[PDB]
């Protein structure tokens, strides 16, 4: 559930970082 | 706006 | 050569014209001459008067509402340099609101030293593109030439062709001229300011504007500094003292102008350091006996009273009547109604004054970009106030920068409080350099400084942003910086991230799409200390782009504001195939000849190495083979829920040798030494990185064939014929070996003598079961046989008849 | 065994412990990274307690474990209550796992199955899916070691159901048991016997509801049933709660707090159903529906379009509004979309420190404001340093009422002070507010709050030409005046640049000093708004703001209409011609009707006399402060010189009038016959002629069958000396034209010859003659070509040509 | 007879004392 | 000065004959 | 921008 | 100068008023 935010805006950095931190 | 596949690669290459 | 005339001060005309007789015997003029409403006067009434007998007016000419004069070449010849000395709003020639004059004719003005010229609302006057005046004027952005008859028609300003020199401009020559019966005298570019002569040699560099004799300070028409009878000198020698920087004269002039004001009716004419000067200066005093300005013994200030405690300063004469002031007993206010600059004049004009007793007071200027224009300004007084109790005022001041460098230039304000309104580009630190110098801290009240208004045009921010970490890849660059932090840490409302492109480097500060960039969260921690960043996305290939940060704060309704800003630096950005290069038409102008033409693609990414075509010999399909063509009918070719489950998956985390040219550099390609007539598939690419891997577009494709070839589809060699028993003709014959890609048909033309024209095809397994073809049945005698052939492109033509005879079995 | 809710797994199997003591989920089962299991984690694992799962199976890389036979064994129902992008079973990227192993899988009633990239996956082809789903048709199994067909498949029948027509086997050691008999999609026992119609699958006890492995429908106190009786609900499809268990979840819930609809326990009410609180029931609103919503704790700051698309849909709040949007990307469309859905707020509206907003008109339909939550000084309606805000609302249209609370109006500097008196005065808010509430200077003091309306004095009009003037209007001192500004839009409806020299004053006894423009590129048929405004100089005492004038809706004439779009002709039938088109670009008022003409053409007359028996055969296929600053300088240089000097002492074709059709049938046509068309549009017939000009096309329909087809006899003459002459009939109408004429020809025993005769062949020798032939029965047979085509061929007709010798 | 200004002042100053 | 007492304001006539001094 | 017998016409037009 | 005037810019209501007293 990530493009009704990343597709119609573009979504902030802490957010994809922890994104990071919980793939890697 | 940036939507999809190249946004799997933009969540690689932020953290590599 | 000498100077008939004597003195002439300075005279104003009005009602008519019977008050211009007592400038008849004049040369010089030590003032101004205004010549103002004249109403019931002809054209006849100005030819029959002139003045060629003027050579030197100082100050200004002022022309206001003069009725029926009609061009100024048959009244004023021979007058030479306008000084300007005091000026008239900071112009020197003025020619406003003024009825039926159509030319100037005003061919004698080669210089005119300090000011401009503004001529508006002249409206039925010609010439005025033909006169050059940065030959005569110094600052020509300061002129104001508008709404005349030149700009609101198109009346013709015709010229000596046949002669006037002509004189670039922008990007063109026009002739440069005053009428239409005379040319502009113009120097050559050795000729500077030390003139010309009626020859074209330079005179002597003393000499102004024009020379009788060259190299020669006897022979000017008028000096450039000095006058001194007959010659043109740098200064006095003794005993003779400077006259209004133009003239030397003796003790006996400069002594009865005292002895005119002292005794009688001012202008005290005094002496200091040879000048005769109207006032002695600030520690310069005047004693009994002499004349002379001696230095004084204690500070001796000048308390210049202004009439009616206030002088609103508007120009240069406004600003002449406080040269020499320190102490101002009043008010300035100071407007400036701007479109020109002021701030070269006003350091030479003020800055001496030191104490203003009254208010200070800025108000509604615009092109006004300092106030470094006062140099020694040190302490506001504020006796009699700006109403209400204040002594400093800004309002709506649009280009205002810098108040004051803080070395040594100290403000001191005893009473009184600051005001501050609308000010785009003058931010709250030089209001706080108020306060911190001034004392004035614990004095001002709510809304006696402007906060949201003042400075919303300029960065002003006054701290260091740095960027911690630039990662860079193809249209996603990683930008990071270092938090800063207020020390209120709820006091940083946000970033906002400016990027614009560029081509080249310079670009200039403060187009700019803004993003809104959200404060971080921290721990309180300086081990990890959380670097914020933003990232940028979907931006195209092989472009520079010019990026800074600056903060935001949320604004502190007492203190300084806060901020930090960044200087930009430059992310270049790398590439990737290119597109397609459209178009592509082959042209086959010869049988073997196939030339492509084609452009470059929509994305070039990079300097391109070159274009990668490929081509193929298509071999021709086996359906054409097996068509019956004599049955007729003879037609022939003349030639997103993939998307979607693991971004919700995502969201739980929480050879064959072909022939090829490498075109370097050109559009263009012919192929050479092909076969006649046969398809080819035809490939091209675009690469801008080959010999470091071959970084190849996409393909498009061409389908193509050449021209037929004539003796190719020509039957060449010998036809022969078995006859049989019963009459039947057998035909032997043989094909060309290259054919226009095939041959379909093959048809005879039968004939004897004297019948008529039969039809038979000959098909492919017509030719090859029958090694030819077959005749059976047949009426004797002579024959005439002839054989095309129809290819695929058309036929070839016919052979020669063939004459044989078949047995008639009768006799 | 016990009902336990749906739950996802990550890293370990201590989740799988507690998926030990569980039987019933009542959700969906997820799994995702098993990445540090073994195969000794999982040849010592075995579940066979689970037998139901509502929503969705997930599956994502799992290390060691080889099938799920030995650990999945009991597992039928499928349900997809939660209908998940229309797929109930998704695996995906399965290392190790050889088979699937589900052999007690009898059910999927709704959902789809979802298979990728599992490398090692083998043993599909075995499994009939359609015994088991009630439709395979979107089931996505794809990217296997079994699409690559290698996989040794193994059956116990090699025993097995078979159902291509292969032995149908889950493992190695269980066969395909779905029951394809009279027990049905119900299903049957091990003995064969049929289980009870509201079983499913399998049955622990035969024909019994009690003693079902699966229900069918429903479930409800250790039976199946077929529908829930009352007072217990449908519980999410499957089973039977009631008042007391839906009134638990709740107050649970006090988290989509469950509802009455249709006798079912379900979440949400749908869209024509509204919440009432004192029966706990979806009532029937179906229309303008009172959408009441809760906030979190009081407030929602919103600050973007992402922020700002939560409460689309939501009409009444329970909170506050804190909004603090800057930028964007062409606004107030989506922005009038959202946030004109309000009806009433319950606490304030703090609209803080925007920037790019210039109406207030997205609002849309808000009349009442309580305002119960309020700031620390008791304000409602809190605007501060909000920019460039031009209007608040229309109020011609809008009114609003503030309940309670103050107001506070401090740094908006581009409103007026009567829209302040208009909000005090409409919104109930006269006596509330206290001293200092509105900063007075701090608002308008850069704005154009004109005090006066100009009048407009005349009017003229034309299709593309509006001539308008209006009154002199000055400035008290009137060389202030820049001119006008005034601003034009297409104008569709009444729901709401050129700039102009000045006029000259002199005096008036009575002069005609009207300014004036008129607009020249126009548009025809088209009503315009045109407001005229004023633009004058910022002076430097109280201020004369300007005047502006009234907006206007003037329509421009109509006169011709345009070219009608694209004539485009396909050929139906050989006397019916459909003609179709587009409408103009300039249709210029409501259009009457379409008039077409069409007219017949005759044929080329160079084609009656060209010989094609010669070769070359081929026929036709058939920035404003610079000059507000730079005027004002020519105003205080004026004044400088003034107190310096003055000082004290016809072809008639066949047409018809196309009424309400975009489409004409050409009827009444000859065949193959090449025609000429005229195209225009009309919008004035009988108030005279204001048809349009012409579009140009031309047509021809499809041929004739039998036009071609030779009809009539063969007959042949025998002269003297050995020649043939025949004549037939020819068709004289053919499709279109003749052309020409083909003899093929064969004697008994010999070839087919050709021979070409044309039209001047025919009509020289009055038919053909042939001369010279061999003696023998020769057989003729003539086809025939036109401009359409070549239609076929006659009879072979036997005649014995003459020999002279017996 | 209003706020006089402009080119017409000069005009008014002649209209009076002609 | 003519123009903040006369076009900043309304004038009379017999302010434009005392005025009329600067002409004649 | 006028410009041909839209200028001839604009004339016609300007001083009805 | 009408033709060439304003088409390669825009001509105002007063010159072709007053350019229609050539008309009359």
Not at chain 3, 447 to 475: M, V
Request: with cysteine; hydrophobic share 35%; aromatic share 10%.
């Amino acid at each position: 559930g990530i493009v009704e935010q990343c597709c119609t805006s573009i979504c902030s950095l802490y957010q994809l970082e922890n994104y990071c931190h919980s793939l890697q | 706006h940036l939507c999809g596949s190249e946004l799997v690669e933009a969540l690689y290459l932020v953290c590599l | 050569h000498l100077y008939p005339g004597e003195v002439c001060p300075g005279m104003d005309i009005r009602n008519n014209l019977t008050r211009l007789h007592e400038l008849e015997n004049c040369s010089v003029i030590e003032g101004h001459l205004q010549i103002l409403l004249m109403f019931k006067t002809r054209p006849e009434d100005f030819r029959d008067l002139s003045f060629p007998k003027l050579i030197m007016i100082t100050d200004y000419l002022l022309l206001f509402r003069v009725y029926g004069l009609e061009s100024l070449k048959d009244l004023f010849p021979n007058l030479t340099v306008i000084r300007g000395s005091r000026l008239f709003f900071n112009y020197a020639l003025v020619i406003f609101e003024m009825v039926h004059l159509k030319e100037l004719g005003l061919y004698n003005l080669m210089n005119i030293t300090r000011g401009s010229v503004r001529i508006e609302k002249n409206n039925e006057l010609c010439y005025l593109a033909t006169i050059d005046w940065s030959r005569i004027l110094d600052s020509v952005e300061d002129n104001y030439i508008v709404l005349n008859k030149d700009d609101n028609e198109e009346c013709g300003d015709i010229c000596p062709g046949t002669n006037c020199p002509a004189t670039v401009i922008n990007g063109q020559f026009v002739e440069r001229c005053w009428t239409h019966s005379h040319c502009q005298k113009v120097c050559p570019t050795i000729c500077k300011s030390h003139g010309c002569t009626a020859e074209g040699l330079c005179c002597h560099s003393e000499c102004l504007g024009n020379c009788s004799q060259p190299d020669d300070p006897t022979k000017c028409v008028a000096c450039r500094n000095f006058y001194l009878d007959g010659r043109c000198v740098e200064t006095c020698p003794p005993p003779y003292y400077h006259f209004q920087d133009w003239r030397c004269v003796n003790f006996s002039f400069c002594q009865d102008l005292h002895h005119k004001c002292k005794n009688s009716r001012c202008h005290q004419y005094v002496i200091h350091n040879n000048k005769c000067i109207p006032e002695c200066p600030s520690g310069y005093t005047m004693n009994s006996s002499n004349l002379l300005c001696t230095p004084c013994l204690g500070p001796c200030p000048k308390v210049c009273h202004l009439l009616e405690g206030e002088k609103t300063i508007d120009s240069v004469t406004s600003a002449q009547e406080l040269r020499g002031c320190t102490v101002i007993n009043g008010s300035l206010i100071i407007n400036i109604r701007g479109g020109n600059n002021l701030a070269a004049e006003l350091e030479a004009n003020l800055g001496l004054i030191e104490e203003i007793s009254g208010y200070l007071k800025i108000r509604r200027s615009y092109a006004l970009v300092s106030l470094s224009f006062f140099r020694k300004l040190r302490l506001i007084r504020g006796e009699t106030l700006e109403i209400g109790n204040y002594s400093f005022y800004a309002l709506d001041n649009q280009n205002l920068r810098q108040l004051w460098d803080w070395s040594k230039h100290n403000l001191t304000i005893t009473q009184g409080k600051l005001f501050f309104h609308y000010n785009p580009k003058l931010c709250l630190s030089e209001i706080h350099k108020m306060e911190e110098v001034s004392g004035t801290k614990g004095r001002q009240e709510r809304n006696d400084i402007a906060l949201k208004t003042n400075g919303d045009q300029a960065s002003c921010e006054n701290e260091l942003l740095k960027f911690s970490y630039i990662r860079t890849s193809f249209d996603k660059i990683l930008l990071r910086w270092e938090p800063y932090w207020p020390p209120d840490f709820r006091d940083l409302l946000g970033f906002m991230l400016f990027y614009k492109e560029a081509p080249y480097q310079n670009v200039t500060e403060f187009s700019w799409t803004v993003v809104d960039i959200d404060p971080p969260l921290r721990s309180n921690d300086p081990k990890s200390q959380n670097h914020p960043g933003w990232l940028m996305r979907g931006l195209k290939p092989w472009t520079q782009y010019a990026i800074f940060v600056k903060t935001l704060v949320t604004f502190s309704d007492e203190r300084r504001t806060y901020g930090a800003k960044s200087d930009i630096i430059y992310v270049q950005t790398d590439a990737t195939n290119p597109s397609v290069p459209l178009d592509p038409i082959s042209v086959s102008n010869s049988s073997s000849q196939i030339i492509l033409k084609w452009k470059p693609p929509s994305d070039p990414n990079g300097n391109i190495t070159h274009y990668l075509v490929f081509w193929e010999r298509q071999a021709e399909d086996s359906e054409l083979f097996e068509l019956d063509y004599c049955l007729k009918g003879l037609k022939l070719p003349s030639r997103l829920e993939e998307s979607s489950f693991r971004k919700t998956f995502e969201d739980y985390l929480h050879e064959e040798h072909r022939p090829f040219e490498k075109v370097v550099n050109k559009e263009s390609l012919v192929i050479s030494g092909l076969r006649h007539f046969t398809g080819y598939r035809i490939e091209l690419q675009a690469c801008n990185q080959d010999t470091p891997e071959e970084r190849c577009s996409v393909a498009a494709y061409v389908s193509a064939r050449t021209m037929p070839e004539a003796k190719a589809d020509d039957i060449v060699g010998p036809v022969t014929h078995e006859i049989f028993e019963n009459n039947v003709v057998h035909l032997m014959w043989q094909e060309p070996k290259e054919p226009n890609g095939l041959i379909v048909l093959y048809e005879v033309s039968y004939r004897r003598y004297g019948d008529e024209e039969l039809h038979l095809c000959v098909s492919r397994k017509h030719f090859a079961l029958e090694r030819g073809c077959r005749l059976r049945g047949l009426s004797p005698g002579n024959y005439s046989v002839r054989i095309r052939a129809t290819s695929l492109a058309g036929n070839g033509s016919w052979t020669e008849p063939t004459y044989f005879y078949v047995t008639d079995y009768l006799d």
